[PDB]
Design a protein around this ligand. Structure first.
Ligand SMILES: Cc1ncc(COP(=O)(O)O)c(C=O)c1O
Ligand SMILES: Cc1ncc(COP(=O)(O)O)c(C=O)c1O
Lengths: 402, 402
């Protein structure tokens, strides 16, 4: 053709960016933006952890260099991330039968894992995801070369986890097929299985010899306790199932821009771990010579230092308490407004994001009348909820669902 | 199988890391490491630009947030990078018929460009590279899905650019085939075509309607003048050829760990530019939600501020002068030692890396006897050369080539 890219077509707009722009152009004083993808403080401003600032001050005092990091990443950061994910007294660390490589946050880890599965996981080409899964998950596996399937995870009838349906779908999954399991808060729905349900899922996976691909990105932030959030992964590991974790420190540490993340794979032996490390480095090098330095250095400094680690844990627990308090206040105000609908699932759900279960027509009613901007599926970000405007949101929800 | 990764094999060791480890384990006092991939000062320590430190201090004073950046990247950084690459008075900027997206340094840009070519460049599947090309170039295009070809670039007989052979190979390239052209210092050889040779190559490309994929990663660092280093790209653009630039600020700015880089594509119209921008964002999002923030912010602060830009240009010119002085001193000391070999190609070559043209047996002779560690092909890093040890290196080369 005359032009190289004359056949290139305009890409579809991102709904999240459209919602954000619609909120920005809105002139109503009482407008709210529940489509935000990051945590916010009470005032609604972006929140930077004081532990992060202390780590930055310490690093600036150290006056370190900016040379390239190993292809795998910073050794201290990888070791600290593995210890945090698996626990300080995990048998895996003692045996050393694990590999951890720094990557570009969770998305990068997910991509690296998908590329590794495409290159080496000869058993199957199908990746199973929850039916209401994170949006980027699909494109990542599609670009990496993996076909995608789905299983039931969320039950719209009870607005909760569909345990029986999920068990049946997992049991129907063909053997030796990779499975994706949101470790903690589900990204779009924030519904997590109960520990007994997690044990049942682990037993089914062990019986079917499936491959688990955990995606822990809200560790600590989900409930303020890192051990309880990582309980499912540790249970899977002690059951004898080798799993992969995609850890993202964007939320639990507030390093959204720093792109901090680690991809760890559990192997049977240290020889297998180092072979997987070599192949992972071989895969990583064409994508990027090395991961970034500043964010990983900050994360390693916070994790290794005891006082900084304690302060970071306290801050994360505080943010988790704020999220839970916002959910509880929303439910209480909905009860006060006189709504007879059962909003227990709002308190039951854990994480930033919530489906109140509102119908799309209710969504347009909220957008046009009360100037509340939210996605069509019904997901709202609790971080956007404020103690000042929680009453307004509850009143609007009650009026729409009247 | 019983194990998921029992069939995974140990990856081949990286020769550069092996050379570095061999240098580290060496106990000779007069040992040198010419395999370093980054610039070093006179003392041999890593060099951090004072302009970078001033920018970091200014950013710390600003007390900015760490929220996610747009998928394309920081707007200020992209605009500044495009202006620096194309020139302040470029017609492309006035017409706005360009797209620039931040990426993970040069490697990332190269990958993004290869992915875009795989998805949209329906004309051909073959990418032509110089015969002595950068090592990572191959794996990047192989993983992205592009077949790779080669053309003659370096003439071992004269240790210089093979102009006639390169012209014949380019003319034999099939029409509408993407071509890779190291903009400045050839990574492995540091040989660049003369401006008349660049004009001839541009005329041949325009006649054959080839697609040019420039990889400018040493702008400014090559000779201390950004305009002269970017002269080939500007000539190609004014000739009417739409080209792609993979800019890496790792060297010209010393931000090796910060992973700073931009991929810019020249289009005919602004509509084509924005369509390409949307498709590039669609491609980028699965790989990583957004590029990192700290390095791009530092680069934008340095480029936009006039005093910081002037100081950065002065520092880059100083490092380029140091590299040229090291080359000249090496040639002068080789002449003093009495060697009759023609070492003019050492001064002719521009960039960090040089092929002195030594045979592999001479390489093992240097490694075993004089404890000088270097790659088998003969490439040496001028940044590793020091005013103190340049005489020792010249004496060793003369003794080996005696
Ligand atoms: C499922 C999932 N993956 C990954 C991430 C983190 O993505 P990023 O890599 O952009 O930090 C999140 C955070 O919202 C998430 O919910
Ligand atoms: C040909 C080439 N491409 C790209 C780069 C930049 O690589 P990175 O992305 O690791 O900064 C360099 C720097 O040495 C190079 O020589």
């Amino acid at each position: 053709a005359s032009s190289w890219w004359t056949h290139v077509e305009m890409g579809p707009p991102d709904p999240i960016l459209g919602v954000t722009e619609a909120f920005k152009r809105d002139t109503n004083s009482k407008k709210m933006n529940l489509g935000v993808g990051a945590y916010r403080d009470d005032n609604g401003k972006p929140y930077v952890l004081p532990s992060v600032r202390k780590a930055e001050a310490q690093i600036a005092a150290k006056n370190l260099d900016k040379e390239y990091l190993p292809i795998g990443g910073l050794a201290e950061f990888c070791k600290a991330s593995a210890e945090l994910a698996l626990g300080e007294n995990s048998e895996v660390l003692k045996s050393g039968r694990f590999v951890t490589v720094q990557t570009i946050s969770g998305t990068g880890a997910l991509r690296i894992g998908a590329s590794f599965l495409q290159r080496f996981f000869k058993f199957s080409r199908d990746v199973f995801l929850p039916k209401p899964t994170w949006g980027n998950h699909t494109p990542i596996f599609r670009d990496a070369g993996m076909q995608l399937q789905g299983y039931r995870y969320y039950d719209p009838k009870t607005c909760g986890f569909d345990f029986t349906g999920a068990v049946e779908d997992i049991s129907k999954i063909p053997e030796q097929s990779v499975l994706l399991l949101h470790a903690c808060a589900h990204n779009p729905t924030g519904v997590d299985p109960r520990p007994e349900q997690w044990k049942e899922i682990a037993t089914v996976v062990k019986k079917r010899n499936l491959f688990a691909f955990f995606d822990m990105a809200y560790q600590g932030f989900a409930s303020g306790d890192g051990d309880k959030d990582a309980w499912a992964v540790r249970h899977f590991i002690e059951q004898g199932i080798n799993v992969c974790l995609c850890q993202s420190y964007a939320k639990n540490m507030g390093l959204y821009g720093e792109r901090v993340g680690a991809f760890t794979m559990v192997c049977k032996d240290a020889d297998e771990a180092k072979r997987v490390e070599s192949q992972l480095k071989i895969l990583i090098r064409p994508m990027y010579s090395n991961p970034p330095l500043n964010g990983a250095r900050i994360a390693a400094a916070i994790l290794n230092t005891p006082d900084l680690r304690k302060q970071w844990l306290q801050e994360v627990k505080v943010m988790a308490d704020r999220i839970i308090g916002m959910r509880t206040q929303l439910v209480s105000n909905l009860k006060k407004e006189g709504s007879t609908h059962n909003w227990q699932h709002i308190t039951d759900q854990i994480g930033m994001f919530c489906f109140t279960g509102l119908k799309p027509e209710q969504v347009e009613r909220l957008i046009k009348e009360f100037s509340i901007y939210m996605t069509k599926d019904g997901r709202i970000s609790v971080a956007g909820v404020t103690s000042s405007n929680v009453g307004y949101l509850a009143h609007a929800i009650h009026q729409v669902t009247k």
